[PDB]
Amino acid sequence: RTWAETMGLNTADTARLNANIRYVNTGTAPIYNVLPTTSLVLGKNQTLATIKAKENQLSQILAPNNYYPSKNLAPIALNAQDDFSSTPITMNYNQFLELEKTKQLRLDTDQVYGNIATYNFENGRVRVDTGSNWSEVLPQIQETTARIIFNGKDLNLVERRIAAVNPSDPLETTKPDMTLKEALKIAFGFNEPNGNLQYQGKDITEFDFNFDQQTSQNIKNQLAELNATNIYTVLDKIKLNAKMNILIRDKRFHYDRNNIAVGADESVVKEAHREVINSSTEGLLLNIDKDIRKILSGYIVEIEDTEGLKEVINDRYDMLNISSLRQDGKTFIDFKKYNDKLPLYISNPNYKVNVYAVTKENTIINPSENGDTSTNGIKKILIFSKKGYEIG
Amino acid sequence: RTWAETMGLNTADTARLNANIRYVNTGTAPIYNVLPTTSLVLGKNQTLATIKAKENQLSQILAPNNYYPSKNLAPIALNAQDDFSSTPITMNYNQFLELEKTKQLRLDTDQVYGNIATYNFENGRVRVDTGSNWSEVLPQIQETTAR
Amino acid sequence: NVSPEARHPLVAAYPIVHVDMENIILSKNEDQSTQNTDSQTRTISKNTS
Amino acid sequence: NVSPEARHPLVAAYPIVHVDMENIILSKNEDQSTQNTDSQTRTISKNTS
């Protein structure tokens, strides 16, 4: 009686890839019959395959601020390379070993095909012209317009483009003159309810202006010729031109080089938790600013003694998760999440509770280089300290 | 109690190639729907394959002084020879041994297909005519001009 | 579907599409096989020495 | 996108496209297979002489 077992392989076809993707439109106009070209990169810049989307991955319409498939649905699969979706995306033995070791595989977006839908004047219907596409149009928008990026609404980058005058082109000098103030008014929704530019009750001086080099050289010459120094006084005397890039950010925060706010300065870090809803050893409801709500990683729970002593519960990297989102906008950070479902056993009501914060400019994912899996490599801010007999 | 172990090969399909390429326009006019024909040369002048770019490798617009894909993105893969991108590029056993020994493989650029986009007087738009390419135009530029 | 701020003549209207990847599913193309065998025999023999 | 120098009637506007190779990835097509097996037997020789 025998018993055998065989296991073959082929070192050019060892594994097959299936990728779950989702399309986003964040512009100002819809795009029809969408087909993105996209490439799967392994490691630094070693491309496995480049796949124009087949007929299975076609989005018929992507209206702005929408998704395909919509966010309550599972993503679509991109798993073929043949023009008829019959041949998979494959990888050899060395790429498979490197992917299993280092786990680095990302997805680039090289371009997007898509059609335009125009108004038919006879019956009023809107019809998709399948000859014209958006690749013949956007390079004419990008060469005649100034660009302004702005994150004064939910700290999200919103990009607009405003038709400004190029002075060395006869057709482009026929457009109307564009100031920076009128561009801010008609592009985003700034107004002057008393005489001062405001974005929903926030003054213009609460934002700062960062330009590109050519744009900053132009703005500097405009300020020299105006005999002015502050840009905030001559906002209706700054002429925009084509191919400008202006970036307007909220002045409080610190940003990385993708312009994402991750950390504020310490005074407004402390000034965010003034009115308090729930204060018990069971939980903590709190009214926090929505702007500073998302920039922080998580809070730490410990108890301040009279002698001087703290009882660090969140002394690790894993459970710096603290939040639990409720339907009122206020998260309830209830303290039986990492405590074997127990309250804070304060043994003496002459004690104080103590809550410190972690921001993402000091948050780490790995442990330290030695054996430190603690909060020894982070920097914290003081927020919450009351006395211990009004807690219960 | 036995343990066996097998290898296999085929001396006309011993290895498959996958080139990472990136186009660049250094002219003064854009070119649309770009599809270069290109050639993989092993060693001195021995050519393994000539591949017109398929539909996965097409650039929709290549403006002057720009790359495709732009230089914060990884290059694109050219790994198929069939018209529908369902057949890999292939070298035999002697070519594979010589490429592993000497490591000489370059990429010639024989020609480039691409379209022209013309102004439309009635509504100001700019429309790519897919019936006229730049190879009807550019030999007329080359014969009446000075470089 | 054109957003209302882009109904001005001086604000452009254009889409900004980008793909993002939520999951990668790799599947190791490998073929395996088992086998069981029984074998009986019976021999009779004789010599004249 | 026609560059400013070529907005003159006497300067030609044409593209100069050129492809350059950044990386070459060869993958040796070769199939390999392993096999493990083990077997037991029992013979009962009843013999007369």
SS (HEC) of chain A:
CEEEEEEECCCCCCEEEEEEEEEEECCCCCEEEEEEEEEEEECCCEEEEEEECCHHHCEEEECCCEEECCCCCCCEEECCCCCCCCCCEEECHHHHHHHHHHCCEEEEEEEEEEEEEEECCCCCCEEEEEEEEHHHCHHHHCCCEEEEEECCCCCCCEEEEEECECCCCCCHHHCCCCEHHHHHHHHCCCECCCCCCECCCCEHHHEEEEECHHHHHHHHHHHHHCCCCCCCCCCCCCECECCCEEEEEECCEEECCCCCEEEECHHHHHCCCCCECCCCCCCCEECCCCCCCCCEEEEEEEEECCCCCCCCCCCCCHHHCCCCCCCCCCCECCCCCCCCCCCCCCCCCCCEEEEEEEECCCCCCCCCCCCCCCCCCCCCEEEECCECCCCC
> Which residues of chain A neighbour D31 with C-beta distances below 8 Å?
8-11
Residue B138 DSSP SS3: helix
Q: Are strands A126-133 and A145-150 parallel, antiparallel or unpaired?
A: unpaired
Q: Are strands A352-359 and A381-384 parallel, antiparallel or unpaired?
A: antiparallel
Q: Quick check: A190 and A199 in contact, CB under 8 A? A: yes
Give the list of residues 6+ apart from residue C7 with CB closer than 8 angstroms, or none: none
Residue A202 sits at φ, ψ, to 5 deg, of -110, 125
Give me the sheet containing A245-250, strands edge to edge: A158-163, A145-150, A245-250, A207-211
Residue D47 DSSP SS3: coil
Tokens encoding D49: 């002489």
**CB-facing half-sphere around the CA of A198: CA atoms within 13 A:** 9
Residues in chain D: 49
> Which residues of chain B neighbour D19 with C-beta distances below 8 Å?
21-24, 36, 38, 107, 109
Amino acid at B17: L
Residue A321 C-alpha from the chain's centroid = 19
Distances (CA, A) of A298 to A155, A211, A316, A392: 19, 33, 12, 24
The neighbour count for residue A213, using CB atoms within 10 Å, is: 8
Measured distance CA(A161)–CA(A364) in Å, rounded: 37
Residue D17 DSSP SS3: strand
Residue B71 DSSP SS3: coil
Q: List % helix, strand, coil for chain B (3-state, nearest 5).
A: 15, 50, 40
Residues in chain A: 392
Method in brief: cryo-EM
For residue A135, give the nearest of B55, B57, B61 by CB distance.
Answer: B61
For residue B34, give the nearest of D1, D17, D20 by CB distance.
Answer: D17
Angle of CA points A369, A375, A381, to nearest 5°: 135
Min Cα distance A165 → chain C (Å) is: 11
Beta pairing partners, A301: A355
Nearest to A387 by CA among A297, A226, A279: A279
- Please classify residue A260 by burial: count the beta carbons closer than 10 Å to its beta carbon, then call 0-12 exposed, 13-18 middle and 19+ buried: middle
Nearest to A27 by CA among B68, B12, D1, C11: C11
Measured distance CA(A250)–CA(A267) in Å, rounded: 15
| Interchain contact, B30 vs D5, CB within 8 Å | no
Residue A222 C-alpha from the chain's centroid = 33
H-run or E-run covering B78: strand B76-78
Picking from D2, D21, D25 by the largest number of A CB atoms within 10 A of its own CB, the best residue to mutate is: D25
Q: Quick check: A91 and A14 in contact, CB under 8 A? A: yes
Measured distance CA(A273)–CA(A278) in Å, rounded: 12
Residue A174 sits at φ, ψ, to 5 deg, of -100, -5
Measured distance CA(A326)–CA(A331) in Å, rounded: 5
Nearest to B26 by CA among C16, D17, A244: D17
Place of tokens 């409801």: A285
Measured distance CA(A328)–CA(A347) in Å, rounded: 33
Measured distance CA(A388)–CA(A390) in Å, rounded: 6
In chain D, what is the straight-line distance between the N-terminal and C-terminal CA atoms, in Å?
106
> Which residues of chain A neighbour B75 with C-beta distances below 8 Å?
45, 47
Nearest to A305 by CA among A348, A341, A361: A348
For residue A5, give the nearest of D31, D37, D41 by CB distance.
Answer: D37
Query: Is omega for the bond preceding A69 within 30 degrees of 0, making it cis?
Result: yes
For residue A1, give the nearest of D23, D35, D40 by CB distance.
Answer: D40
Measured distance CA(A249)–CA(A258) in Å, rounded: 12
Measured distance CA(A29)–CA(C3) in Å, rounded: 7
Beta pairing partners, B115: B32, B133
Nearest to A23 by CA among C15, B76, C12: C15
Distances (CA, A) of C24 to A31, A46, A105, A153, A383: 26, 17, 8, 33, 41
Place of tokens 């710096």: A320
* DSSP per-residue letters across B13-45: SSEEEEEEEEEEE-SSS-EEEEEEEEEEEETTT
Q: Quick check: A92 and A11 in contact, CB under 8 A? A: yes
Q: Are strands A145-150 and A245-250 parallel, antiparallel or unpaired?
A: parallel
Nearest to D38 by CA among A5, B3, C35, B1: B1
Question: B22 touching A, CB under 8 A?
Answer: no
Resolution, in Å, please?
3.2
Nearest to D22 by CA among B54, B71, B50: B71
Give the list of residues 6+ apart from residue A101 with CB closer than 8 angstroms, or none: none
Q: Quick check: A110 and A50 in contact, CB under 8 A? A: yes
Measured distance CA(B34)–CA(B76) in Å, rounded: 14
Counting CB pairs under 8 A, whether chains A and B reach 3 or more, is: yes
**CB-facing half-sphere around the CA of C49: CA atoms within 13 A:** 3
Residue A246 C-alpha from the chain's centroid = 19
Min Cα distance B23 → chain D (Å) is: 5
The neighbour count for residue B86, using CB atoms within 10 Å, is: 16
Measured distance CA(C4)–CA(C2) in Å, rounded: 6
User: Which residue of chain A comes nearest to C39, CA vs CA?
Assistant: A1
Measured distance CA(D21)–CA(B75) in Å, rounded: 9
Measured distance CA(A285)–CA(A20) in Å, rounded: 37
Question: A319 touching C, CB under 8 A?
Answer: no
Nearest to A50 by CA among C19, C15, B108: C19
Measured distance CA(A30)–CA(A67) in Å, rounded: 11
Tokens encoding A183: 């561009």
Q: Are strands A66-68 and A15-25 parallel, antiparallel or unpaired?
A: antiparallel
Residue A326 C-alpha from the chain's centroid = 22
Q: Quick check: A182 and A192 in contact, CB under 8 A? A: no
Q: Quick check: D20 and B19 in contact, CB under 8 A? A: no
The neighbour count for residue B68, using CB atoms within 10 Å, is: 24
Measured distance CA(A296)–CA(A263) in Å, rounded: 7
Measured distance CA(B129)–CA(A282) in Å, rounded: 70
Tokens encoding A60: 């018929």
Nearest to A346 by CA among A295, A308, A376, A391: A391
The radius of gyration of chain C from alpha carbons, rounded to an integer in Å, stands at 38
Residue A205 sits at φ, ψ, to 5 deg, of -70, -5
Q: Quick check: A113 and A36 in contact, CB under 8 A? A: yes
Tokens encoding A205: 């001086």
| Interchain contact, D14 vs B7, CB within 8 Å | no
> Which residues of chain A neighbour C15 with C-beta distances below 8 Å?
25, 27-31, 62, 64, 112, 114, 134
Helical H segments across B1-147, by residue range? 93-102, 138-144
The neighbour count for residue A126, using CB atoms within 10 Å, is: 10
| Interchain contact, B28 vs D11, CB within 8 Å | yes
Give me the sheet containing B2-6, strands edge to edge: B2-6, D33-39, A2-8, C32-37
Measured distance CA(B135)–CA(B76) in Å, rounded: 25
Q: Looking at residue B74, what DSSP letter applies?
A: P
User: Which residue of chain B comes nearest to D37, CA vs CA?
Assistant: B2
Q: Quick check: B116 and B129 in contact, CB under 8 A? A: yes
- Count how many pairs of residues, chain A against chain B, have C-beta atoms within 8 Å: 79
> Which residues of chain B neighbour A51 with C-beta distances below 8 Å?
56
Measured distance CA(A352)–CA(A339) in Å, rounded: 18
Measured distance CA(A285)–CA(D24) in Å, rounded: 58
Amino acid at A189: G
Measured distance CA(B105)–CA(C10) in Å, rounded: 52
Angle of CA points A131, A135, A136, to nearest 5°: 70
Place of tokens 């002429």: A239
| Interchain contact, A9 vs D32, CB within 8 Å | yes
Selected residues 67-96 of chain A with any CB under 8 Å from a CB in chain D: 92-95
Tokens encoding A318: 């894993």
Residue B140 sits at φ, ψ, to 5 deg, of -85, -30
| Interchain contact, D30 vs B31, CB within 8 Å | no
User: Please, what sign has the CA dihedral across residues A247, A253, A257, A262?
Assistant: negative
For residue D13, give the nearest of B9, B17, B29 by CB distance.
Answer: B29
For residue C1, give the nearest of A6, A30, A134 by CB distance.
Answer: A30
- Collect all residues from C whose CB is shorter than 8 A from any CB in A: 1-3, 5-6, 8-39
Domains recognised in chain A with CATH numbers: 1-142 (2.60.120.240), 143-261 (3.10.20.110), 262-391 (2.60.40.810)
> Which residues of chain A neighbour D42 with C-beta distances below 8 Å?
none
- Count how many pairs of residues, chain A against chain D, have C-beta atoms within 8 Å: 56
Question: A137 touching C, CB under 8 A?
Answer: yes
Q: Quick check: A132 and A116 in contact, CB under 8 A? A: yes
Query: Is omega for the bond preceding B64 within 30 degrees of 0, making it cis?
Result: no
Question: A12 touching B, CB under 8 A?
Answer: yes
> Which residues of chain B neighbour D41 with C-beta distances below 8 Å?
none
